[PDB]
Structure 1
Amino acid sequence: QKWKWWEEERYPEGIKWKFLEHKGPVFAPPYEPLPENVKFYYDGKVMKLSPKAEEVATFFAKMLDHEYTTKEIFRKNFFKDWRKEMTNEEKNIITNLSKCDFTQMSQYFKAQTEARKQMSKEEKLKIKEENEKLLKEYGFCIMDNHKERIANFKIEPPGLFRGRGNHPKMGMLKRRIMPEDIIINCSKDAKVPSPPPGHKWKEVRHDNKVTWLVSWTENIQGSIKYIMLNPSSRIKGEKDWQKYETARRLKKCVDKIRNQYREDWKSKEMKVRQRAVALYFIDKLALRAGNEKEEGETADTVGCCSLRVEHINLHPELDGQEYVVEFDFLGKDSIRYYNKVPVEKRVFKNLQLFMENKQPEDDLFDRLNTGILNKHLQDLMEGLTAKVFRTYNASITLQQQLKELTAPDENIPAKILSYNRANRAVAILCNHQRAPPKTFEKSMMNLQTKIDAKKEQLADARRDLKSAKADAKVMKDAKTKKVVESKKKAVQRLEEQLMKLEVQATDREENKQIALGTSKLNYLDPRITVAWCKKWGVPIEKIYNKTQREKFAWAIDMADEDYEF
């Protein structure tokens, strides 16, 4: 089509659409039972299970490979939830989990998977084709004059929850989502989608102030899950753009706030002193303002405002630095945040005051929570909140570091390295860690062997040139002195090759325990990127793949080479 929505006038705040029509959500493929020969054993005696329970048994049989299926919490929860999905001959016989034998089911599944990567184009293409009849019928919805794409219209299948980290609910069954759980949201003038035969949707609402197409209540933590639009849409873009534009507004008066909190580290009231120290951490250390959460329903992890006392430790002078805080805690997605950080004299003397006669299990910031912090932030700048501090620090660091890295002289894949090194700088700030792929890091030897090979191809292009400079001394004609210029051009064509290969070796190494994923799509103004690519002639696709190009299709078209965040 080619729809420039960024040129259109905005929508009067709070009203999100006028028209919304979609063929609804796609359900999970119905459960296909086990064939006779894949028997299940309880107490060593052959037991055949009812479809409800057998379904729940496969979920466990498939995860057997994992170390977590031995964890107490996991076996406790799972089993409690399996008993429930069992009949009475079964709730009588199957007393504990530990006496059931899934090994046969488990092996059948490892077989089906290996005997899937073995079908030829005769059966393989027939699936990739049937899937395309689907993405077309259910994957696009019409929202106000335009056919826009839906994110993940395919509803999540029932399995067992595991979640990240030490989740208290790990093991609990994720119930299959029936149409009687689904609320559809469309316009009054839209052709309301038809439910699967023999079912009704939970509600057909026309709430035009929301951007969601379908919503149901999932049951592990009782949170409301949704089916929203593709990031390439208007309803997701206007928004993302607003967010970077709000990140830019914070820049105009960032120094002003960094002056007031610097002075607020004095204040007569203790409660203002907290709200200021917290603000420093979020600013200079890019911390998620930690909202509090229900104990026993989430993995114990925290952010800034929820920082318990046991999570921070003081040190006056360590490893040569003056006035340091030894940060150690589990942040979002249970990823660790270890950092020895040198603060200002006041702040250190201010943290001591916050820990003074307090128990390890208690809050560092008493009578402070994210609500209070955001209330202040909102007074400071219209529309401000605490994530903007991570978006700004992320963006302003990508742009300023591209200026400090990208050299005019350098070739095209070297710019990519200078860029990736800037991207990296954000990821270390934002604590966007990654764990090096499971024993797949011997592929550093099989990328370095390609280099200690290209060094030999070029070793000899020089040794071949050194013969031509001993032949251009005795006999200096049109077919000698010009045969050197084609043997030096050959050293050059292989230099620019070895260089690309070696630049792509340190871009892989420095990035072994760092994830640039999140910062690329979620933090970082894409215009900062487009500006740079238009400026140094690096073709856009060398930085952004297709879904990233699609999401960022508003920036690509808009920003000039001169754009400055």
Structure 2
Amino acid sequence: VKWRTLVHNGVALPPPYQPKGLSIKIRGETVKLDPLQEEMAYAWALKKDTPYVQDPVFQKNFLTDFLKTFNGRFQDVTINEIDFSEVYEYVERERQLKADKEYRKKISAERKRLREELKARYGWAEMDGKRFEIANWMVEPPGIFMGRGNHPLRGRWKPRVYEEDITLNLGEDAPVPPGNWGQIVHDHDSMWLARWDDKLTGKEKYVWLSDTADIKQKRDKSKYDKAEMLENHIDRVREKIFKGLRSKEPKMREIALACYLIDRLAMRVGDEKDPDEADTVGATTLRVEHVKLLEDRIEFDFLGKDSVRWQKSIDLRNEPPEVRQVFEELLEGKKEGDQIFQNINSRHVNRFLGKIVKGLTAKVFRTYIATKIVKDFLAAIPREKVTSQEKFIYYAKLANLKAAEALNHKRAPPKNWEQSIQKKEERVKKLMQQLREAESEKKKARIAERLEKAELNLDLAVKVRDYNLATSLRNYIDPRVYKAWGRYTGYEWRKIYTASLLRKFKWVEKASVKHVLQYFAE
């Protein structure tokens, strides 16, 4: 049994939709939208400047749910016959409002306040007398469904969930929290707190405690899913970065420049406390002496711990004048040893990123970069060159090395590197001789296998000298790429990972890799 007492307050249900009295035109005919119809028309209009509303599968899926809200009429209307202009213009006026700086802060101040109030009410459970934080106590509002980009249900409506739909898991004598709950169960074999059926996909959705395997697996997978969603829309995200460089707010112009460094150099923000990256270059760690503004390029030169030198440059040819200007604007009147990015932290950068694509962050962005590098490297390898499990591992690690370079995970060489390389060279030379004196077939095969590992290990040890591969393998490389690599070639991809990493990526066993395997197989 996992618990004897379980006490919580249930889940927070999403607030009702507030109608705005909007209308659309169908075949030139003005239709005043009812609440539900307007709610879906508004969700459609929010996506007006995205590719999704151009996708024919997306459109028909939306229309399947949208037209049902007009029972009796418009049963055969297609997407071109609907004029959403009135709803598009409302969304524009909404964006017009948020263009004011002090109007954004007051809205964020109250949404933080309402969130802090609801978190004290719903965010805590008592299990066997111990008070635990609840991870996902908020029921998501209805909206348009989106998957990784090619989901067969993309564009369908996610219908609203009510208290009557929800099952709570509680102790037998725990008080039943307020609400018209669908049912109360007492499932001592389960540590979920609430559950309901997704009204579109039929998948059961569970509320879990924080810091459990279930919530860690779900959030881990979510980061890589967001990174995969970026693959199709990286072009639009870049243009929005340049737009932030043209901002009239100085804080937003600086934040946009940091994001531009993420896109072009995979440079971290600089304020993550975690040790595996804390000593590598980052935006907030850049100082005037680390950057020299030239005419043809910007050149970066960072001296880190153990005197490891990191040097990269950005080509300024064909780049918008805003990148050079905001750099100049941040460089003007600053001496050596002075910080370039003074109003930068991850919260500011991620808020700016979230406005472009919801959920987008620096960590997701660099995950997309690292993962794409690994994919492209592996995709270029002819299958005939992958002649054994050992060679399969070799190429996977070389790809890991490429992502380490892209994400600037440079390091000082291991202390006895040259002498370690010395000893690997003598072992392979020793192993080659023992093979040419080995006579029977059992020993000729066993020594050939040990030899093959040795020469590839040797070449690897030389190439990985200056780079820490573990950081990107654990945090920034989608494990579905390696699983797909294993399916494509037929070799065991699980040997790429330590036991700890196999636990962290347990969710990849169940996950589809069709998206990547199709790329490998094209």
The alignment's TM-score, normalised by the length of structure 2, stands at 0.53
Task: Tell me the residue number matched to 1:410.
Answer: 386
1:273, CA displacement in angstroms?
3.7
Distance 1:209 1:358, change over 3 A: same
Q: State the match for 2:291 in structure 1.
A: 313
Does residue 533 of the first structure (1) align with residue 509 of the second (2)?
Answer: no
1:308 touches 1:361 (CA, 8 Å); kept in 2?
no
Contact 1:285 1:429 in 2 (8 A): yes
Decide which of 212, 221, 235 is 2:215's aligned counterpart.
235
Aligned equivalent of 2:409, options 432, 436, 454: 432
Question: Residue 329 of structure 1: CA displacement?
Answer: 5.2
Q: 1:246 aligns with which of 226, 238, 251?
A: 226
Kindly indicate whether the alpha-carbon contact (under 8 Å) linking 1:290 and 1:305 is maintained by their aligned counterparts in 2. yes
Letter in 1 for 2:379: K
Q: CA deviation at 1:427?
A: 1.1
Mapped partners of 2:429, 2:502: distance in 1: 35
Aligned residue among 251, 256, 272 for 1:276: 256
Mapping of residues 125-524 of structure 1, within 5 Å: 187-188=125-126, 190-192=127-129, 205-209=131-135, 229=211, 233-262=213-242, 265-266=245-246, 271-291=251-271, 304-307=282-285, 309-314=287-292, 316=294, 322-328=296-302, 330=304, 338-345=310-317, 346=321, 347-348=323-324, 350-365=326-341, 369-405=345-381, 407-411=383-387, 412-439=389-416, 442-458=419-435, 498-524=451-477
> What SS does the corresponding residue of 2:298 show, helix, strand or coil?
strand
Shift of 1:506: 0.7
Conservation of the 8 A alpha-carbon contact between 1:335 and 1:433: no
For the residue of structure 2 that corresponds to 1:252, the secondary structure is coil
Q: Provide closer, same or farther for how the CA distance between residues 406 and 274 of structure 1 changes in structure 2, counting only shifts above 3 A.
A: farther
Q: Where do 5+ consecutive residues of structure 2 fail to align?
A: 1-9, 15-122, 138-190, 192-208
Secondary structure of the residue that 2:510 maps to in structure 1? helix
- For residues 243 and 128 of structure 2, the distance between their equivalents in structure 1, rounded to whole angstroms, comes to 59
Question: Closer, same or farther in 2 for the Cα pair 1:309/1:436, shift >3 Å?
Answer: closer
Alpha-carbon shift at residue 563 of structure 1 (Å): 3.8
Residue 398 (structure 1) shift:
1.5
Shift of 1:495: 5.9
Change (3 A) 1:284 1:237: same
How much has 1:241 moved relative to structure 2? Answer: 0.5
Aligned AA for 1:235?
Answer: I
Could you tell me how far 1:497 is from its partner in structure 2? 5.3
Residues 298 and 316 of structure 2 are in contact (CA less than 8 Å); yes or no, is this contact kept in structure 1? no
The percentage of counterpart residues that share the same residue type is 27
How far apart are the structure 2 equivalents of 1:335 and 1:380? 38
Counterpart contact for 2:410–2:467, Cα < 8 Å: yes
What secondary structure sits across from 1:445 in the alignment? helix
Q: Distance in 2 between matches of 1:552 and 1:282?
A: 25
Measure, in 1, the Cα distance between the counterparts of 2:13 and 2:340. 37
* Paired residue secondary structure (1:383): coil
Larger relative helix fraction = 2
Shift of the 453–14 alpha-carbon distance from structure 1 to 2, 3 Å rule, reads farther
Backbone CA RMSD of aligned residues: 4.1
2:280, 2:410 within 8 Å by CA — same for their partners in 1?
no
SS of the equivalent of 1:324 reads strand
Aligned length: 323
Is this contact kept in 2: 1:337–1:431, CA < 8 A? no
Structure 1 contact 289–303 (Cα < 8 Å) conserved: no
The superposition leaves residues 80-109 of structure 1 with CA deviations (integer Å, 9 ceiling, x where unpaired) of xxxxxxxxxxxxxxxxxxxxxxxxxxxxxx
- The alpha carbon displacement at 1:238 in A equals 0.4
Whether contact under 8 Å (1:265, 1:277) holds in the other structure is: yes
Partner SS for 1:443: helix
Give the residue type in structure 2 aligned to 1:546: A
Distance of 2:300 and 2:416 partners within structure 1: 31
User: Following TM superposition, by how much is the alpha carbon of 1:280 offset from its aligned partner in structure 2, in angstroms?
Assistant: 1.5
Q: What is the TM-score normalised by the length of structure 1?
A: 0.49
Give the C-alpha shift of residue 536 in structure 1: 1.1
Deviations 1:424-469 (A, max 9, x none): 11112222234444437523222222211233245568xx9xxxxx
For residue 492 of structure 1, report the CA deviation from its aligned partner: 8.5
CA distance in structure 2 between the aligned counterparts of 1:243 and 1:559, rounded to whole angstroms? 16
